[PDB]
From a paper:
One example of siderophore piracy is the uptake of ferrioxamine B, a hydroxamate siderophore produced by many Streptomyces species, by the specific OM transporter FoxA. FoxA belongs to the family of TBDTs (transducers) and is involved in ferrioxamine B transport as well as modulation of transcriptional cascades in the bacterial cell. Here, we determined several crystal structures of FoxA from P. aeruginosa, in the apo state as well as in complex with the siderophore ferrioxamine B and TonB. Our results indicate that the transporter can exist in several different conformations, and that both substrate- and TonB-binding is required to form a translocation-competent state of the FoxA transporter in a two-step TonB-binding mechanism necessary for transport function.
In order understand the mechanism of complex formation between FoxA and TonB we determined the crystal structure of the ternary complex consisting of FoxA bound to ferrioxamine B and the C-terminal TonB domain (residues 251-340, referred to hereafter as TonBCt). Two complexes were present in the asymmetric unit, with crystal contacts generated through the exposed soluble regions of both proteins. We could resolve almost an entire FoxA molecule including the signalling domain (residues 53-820, with 11 amino acids missing from the N-terminus after the signal peptide) as well as the full TonBCt. Similar to the FhuA and BtuB-TonB complexes the primary interaction site between FoxA and TonBCt occurs through β-augmentation with parallel strands forming between residues 332-337 of TonB and residues 142-146 of FoxA. In addition to the observed β-augmentation, the unstructured polypeptide segment upstream of the TonB box (residues 135-141) forms complementary contacts with the surface of TonB molecule mediated by backbone H-bond interactions as well as side-chains Leu137, Met139 and Val142 located in a small cavity on the surface of TonB. The secondary point of contact involves the side chains of residues in the periplasmic loops and barrel interior of FoxA with several residues in the loops of TonB facing the barrel. These contacts are mediated by electrostatic forces between TonBR271 and FoxAD352, and between TonBR266 and FoxAD355 as well as a side-chain (FoxAE316) to the backbone carbonyl (TonBS300) via a hydrogen bond. In our crystal structure, the TonB fragment is located almost perpendicular to the β-barrel and the membrane plane highlighting the potentially dynamic nature of TBDR-TonB complexes, which has been suggested by recent EPR experiments. However, when ligand-loaded, FoxA association with TonBCt leads to the closure of the extracellular loops, shielding the bound siderophore inside the barrel. The inward movement of loop 8, which is seen in the ternary complex with TonBCt, places Lys657 into close proximity of the bound ferrioxamine B with its ε-amino group protruding towards the hydroxamate groups coordinating Fe3+ on the opposite side of His374.
Author numbering:
A (entry chain B): 53 to 130, 135 to 149, 155 to 820
B (entry chain A): 53 to 149, 155 to 820
C (entry chain D), D (entry chain E): 251 to 340
Write the structure that this text describes.
Amino acid sequence: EQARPYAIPAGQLGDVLNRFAREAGITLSATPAQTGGYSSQGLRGSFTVQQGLARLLADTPLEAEDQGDGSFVLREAPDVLNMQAVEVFALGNDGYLATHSQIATKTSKPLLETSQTVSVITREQIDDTASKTVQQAMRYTPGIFTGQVGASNRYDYVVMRGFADNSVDNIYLDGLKAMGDSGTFSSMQVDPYFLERIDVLKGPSSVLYGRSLPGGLVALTSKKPLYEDYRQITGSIGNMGQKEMGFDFSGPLDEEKRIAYRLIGLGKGSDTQFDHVKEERYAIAPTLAIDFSDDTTLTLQGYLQHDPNGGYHGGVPADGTLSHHNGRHISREFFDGEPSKDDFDRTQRMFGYQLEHRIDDVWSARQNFRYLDSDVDLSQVYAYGWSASEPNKLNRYFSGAREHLQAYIVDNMLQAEFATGAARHTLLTGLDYQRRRTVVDWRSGSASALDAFNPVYGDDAISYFPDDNHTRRLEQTGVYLQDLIDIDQWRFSLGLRQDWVSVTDKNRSTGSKADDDWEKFTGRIGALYLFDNGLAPYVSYSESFNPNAYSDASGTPLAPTEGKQWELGLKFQAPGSNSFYTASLFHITQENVASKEPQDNFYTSVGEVRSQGLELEAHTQLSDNLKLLGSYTYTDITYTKSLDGNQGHTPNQAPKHMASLWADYAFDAGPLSGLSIGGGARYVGETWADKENTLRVPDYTLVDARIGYDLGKLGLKGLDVSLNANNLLDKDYVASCYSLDFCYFGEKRNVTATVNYQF
Amino acid sequence: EQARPYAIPAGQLGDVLNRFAREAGITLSATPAQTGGYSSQGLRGSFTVQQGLARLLADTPLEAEDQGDGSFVLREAPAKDGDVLNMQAVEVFALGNDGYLATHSQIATKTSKPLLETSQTVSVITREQIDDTASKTVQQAMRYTPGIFTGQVGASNRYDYVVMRGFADNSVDNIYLDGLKAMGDSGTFSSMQVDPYFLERIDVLKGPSSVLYGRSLPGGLVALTSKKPLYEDYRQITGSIGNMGQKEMGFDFSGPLDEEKRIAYRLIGLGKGSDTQFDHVKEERYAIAPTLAIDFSDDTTLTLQGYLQHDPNGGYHGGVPADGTLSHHNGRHISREFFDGEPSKDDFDRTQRMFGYQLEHRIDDVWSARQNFRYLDSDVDLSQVYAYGWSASEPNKLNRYFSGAREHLQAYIVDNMLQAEFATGAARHTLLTGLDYQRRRTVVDWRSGSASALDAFNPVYGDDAISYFPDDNHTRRLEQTGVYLQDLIDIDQWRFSLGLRQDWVSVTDKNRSTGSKADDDWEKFTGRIGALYLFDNGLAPYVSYSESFNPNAYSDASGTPLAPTEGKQWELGLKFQAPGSNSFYTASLFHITQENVASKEPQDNFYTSVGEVRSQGLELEAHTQLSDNLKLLGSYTYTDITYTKSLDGNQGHTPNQAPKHMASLWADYAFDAGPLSGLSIGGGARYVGETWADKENTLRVPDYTLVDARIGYDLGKLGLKGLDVSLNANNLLDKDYVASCYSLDFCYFGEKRNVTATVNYQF
Amino acid sequence: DSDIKPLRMDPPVYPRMAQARGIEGRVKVLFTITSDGRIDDIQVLESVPSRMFDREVRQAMAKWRFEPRVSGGKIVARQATKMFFFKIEK
Amino acid sequence: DSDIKPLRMDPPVYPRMAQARGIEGRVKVLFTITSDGRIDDIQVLESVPSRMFDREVRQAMAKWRFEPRVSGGKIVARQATKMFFFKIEK
């Protein structure tokens, strides 16, 4: 009859009706259908049961009736009606796996339906494996050989399918070639800290991507701006005086969220494993997205980067590493150069933009542009073989360079997506232009010999040979066309390109200018089949055309490198599992290859080299916690046309066998929640040291490990810590050789500890 | 245009549409509203998006739009002719139906009222409390409750001695089970014990509660409320291993019996053992307890209950002189493991057997009937050699005597209650009349003697020779009938309370050995009045005046029977609970006078009335919910009790085994932090003041503080779901102490440290 | 032209002795939505616990009211199926 | 003698390049359900992030259809408010 006094908060009316029901001692029988969207109020003392109910659903069209035993039920009732609110959700869109790439095809398409061998390395991987360079991030990816100059981090060397020549000019950044001049020292590096993905296209890709080599390309993916406030600060301290600090802010600027920025920045250093050596870098990448109308969006991007120190990039004889020299080994520290005259100062300035426009439901244009301005300074003394007179001192030579580069590149794509009743087409047409001017001033000379065990530094004296200064220009323009036809369980890929190129080099100190032009049609025919299995076999016949900017020792310049690949392949994703397997079997034949030998200032061209093999690739997310990754490569490569004397022989720094497993367990329950333990092994087969097949660089297995803990669980949210060890077993080993006087050590144990703060 | 293969399992169509939108790489906008009661049974084939979406939503009235690449929306198509329409399901929820606290008592008022509105001091001990505090008997479970002194015979677990507001005489028959008195016979050895494994709650009614629960003492009573059957299958297996030979498995299955769920059972079982702190003693029990409830129409339910218990071994029940425990006897102490008796001529074999029903029938909108019935049958067997002061010739030896018994008990009790809930304008009523009735018949074959003397430290056992007196055989009858009437009137912010009772009792005792008999009849009118004022605030003072009437079947040294004990109590009170808040505070102030308390010294087979005793004091109780994981219990008890008529030259003195001051705190907090989810640490300390040792107040027993501790961990989180474990320890600091003394010749040790590692398994 | 459009379909009330002894369960029920707008020919296909919730589900459905099915030009009956779940909150 | 009774109240489509960027939001809206039984005079009261979802919401509402409100036996227009919440799964 009489009332009670209540004290009740607010919130989705359901709850408030519940608290009330409990506290009144009644029973409300009601459905989430009817209390649903409502969300409200509160109760503020001094009501009968009924009038409380009335006053609770006062602002709604509900009302509760009945009696007899405090059995009530909700119903309906009669200014302004408050309808239930609605929650509309976007249904639609993983760990070390990506099933999807835009890069392979210039259009978004799952890997299951794409007729070319492709790997993707994710952020998560890069950070779990502690890969500190682009080169290192591929240490777990098949058909790629890492250790090519061993421990040196000055350049990203990437050996595709046993093709280890021409291996630095291979990296594309948001689908535009880097634009360094691999014919000089002015080659560019990108830091992992700025990446989302690395996509690796094994085998010819010249049709979409302009100066591609026939073994493939590596494609880096810049990490664009987010549309809600994200802020991350990171810090990392490790051995070899490793010290790194970065930040990665992003967000939207306006209230309509049609503009957003991203600002990634880092500085870091390392004393390496080599004596008197420094690696040191600072970089900043602002990015700005701005939507114009509702179908045209603009992204302005920069990447300023300055390496005032260039780590070590040198090598020593196999006679003293693979073999005992007298009775001694050259240390896997060991420096071969005067610290007074050792200088590497690269500076990369990159501005560009990404312009997307929508035209119909059919058509769409895209324009990607980037301007490069760089500056490299070199002083470097180096060890080439043993002294003819002092028997434990290496002879040494000098190479110094001031070189300024500027280059730009651009890519216009027009993309019509239609149907022909039966089929579905996704047709691409483009025009791409690049040009690059490198002005170099180089000097060589000879230097003092140095004890290979117990060196004494000082004697930065150099007897300079006369200066070699040059001005290299290259311009290239291509037109391309690519239809991706899709009928039933079949997918076909057709592709055609027509490159025109022009390359010069006025030898400013002689006079000699060479000046040449080349032209070439290229293309891609490729068909696939998708069984209800989840099983997708395919063939591909692919070509590549890569114009080259180098010279002979005979003076005359090298012709473009050519490529023909047949590949038979099998992809398998069991109907939406969290797994993917690929098995690829290939046959590339490059004509005119282009080696160096690191003692000459000149290239040798080849005449055909042939490669063939097998790649098995596996990613499997065997549970909600454990993730797994593994590969086996088998490579069979041979100089099939050369006059070095080695026709019929096998190239050096190309292992037949390679294998890698990696695993990461992450506990998500119990005592040990937030803990992650991860590891892997890497195996490189035997390689040769020389192209005469004389001497073998022995095989090696590396172990890598990882402990990691989210301190969110303890209490400090957005905060974690991780401890990494790469080459856990501190192996002392020769990774590879370029020649019998130039063998390189592997990176000794790299321990690193990291602290992270997110948002 | 073209199809890919999918494999999506089944579930609340939302999910299954999500997995799909994902694997096709379209997007699809929908709302819970529209994907509500739809079940899905999902794709496994090769399909074309549209076709897959279509297939997915084929059993519903939904359809998916498209609108160009990706996109897709759930509109409601028309109308898919097919055949049958599958309407959205619906969930209909019932609304409004923590731990150590309970804000309602069904026992206090014989009808369910909140405690804030009940005008008498009631404490509640929950099942959870019992299990956290590792309380192994009823007596023990009240160790943290205020009012109540637990240490009456110390470590003895043969009986439940429960001293309420310092009235420690006559303290065994304080126990009611499912609202009917125990029906033991406090006059013999045949006094029943209830295992806490079979209980849900213990509600403590302090002060005179005779009106509603006949033949109760002025101290009040302790009310056991047993587990009843559940209408959802629930299964449980308990295992426990502990020190002092402690061993225990038990099970608890409850569930429904038919598919219409008009019937449910509850089978509870239990086997336990312990070789106690004391030399050569055992404590062994087995019991089964089947409960079964059957609804007769929509108006009626009948519950059948059984409780069969065997205690083949009786634990320890004995004491030793104050000289040698509170003093030093010819320079040493008697240990806390000292034996006393003689094995092979010391046993207590008890068998308890209880059958009964509870009939509940709703007569109409206003009126209702409840009928509670219990039959009890019992068989106690006793031999007990025991110690009684120091030998007059050998100096370090204790004099010893013998008490043997054979007792068949048989009793039944019933309580009929008729209840009317009506209104009188502003007056809200809950009027209740009853009539209740108990018959009890105890046939006892007692036997008694003098044993050998025993060295109190280094005893040599094996002289179980006994010189007997004549056997003493009696047959003891008690019959009691009550008519009672209780209205609870509730106007505006007042809650009145008004009770009226008329007991009629009759007690006979044929001494079958003498032939001679003591037939006696008594009557008394008892009542209470209680006014409580409740503030919107949460706060409620109250005053209570209440009366007690308790027939005694005991005899003098000469045999002249003892008169009933009577009691009057004025209580002033203050309960407070903030609206919403999970804390509850009470302060209670009381003055109780009893007439004719029946005392009894161990050595004796007789009782003595005591002209009058009075207790006045204060009780502060506080349960708080300090956070989401921390919970608390705390209490203070001030008790000033005194013999105010006595013709033994102890008039003015204070009764022994009654402590003036006792307080206790207990907390337990339980994590959900990632590192430690399901882990719980809990503990408490318990303080007891000085006690007297002496009706003549010559010695005093020191005070004592005891610590208790527990760790608990749900092994369900660590993967093994349902399983959980638990380690407790009672008297963690392993105090060696005398808990109370009955007299100068009988002082008892408190339990030593009791470690108990326990395992569980749910459903 | 159209289908069933609900106009009154208030839900049913949990049984008294079901909340008490928190019970829970379900009813599945096949029925007809007459040309005349009202519910008819109710058939219960599932009842857990047996025949417990049925009588409210029936009594609630009594009251229900719909715009009936249109099948190009004559109004038509409709056979339907619906599931009631009964639940307890906390 | 009656109220609004909705007959087609199909929800708005999550706008693309909004869900691409994973943006959630909300619109509150005040409107009229005319004698006609259709929606009219759509006034958008809250809109977070400003002007993002509004278009989709207006478009959806303009397809909605109701039994209009009846009051003392004459078809009558009626004022109403609704909230929409745009969210992204998982």
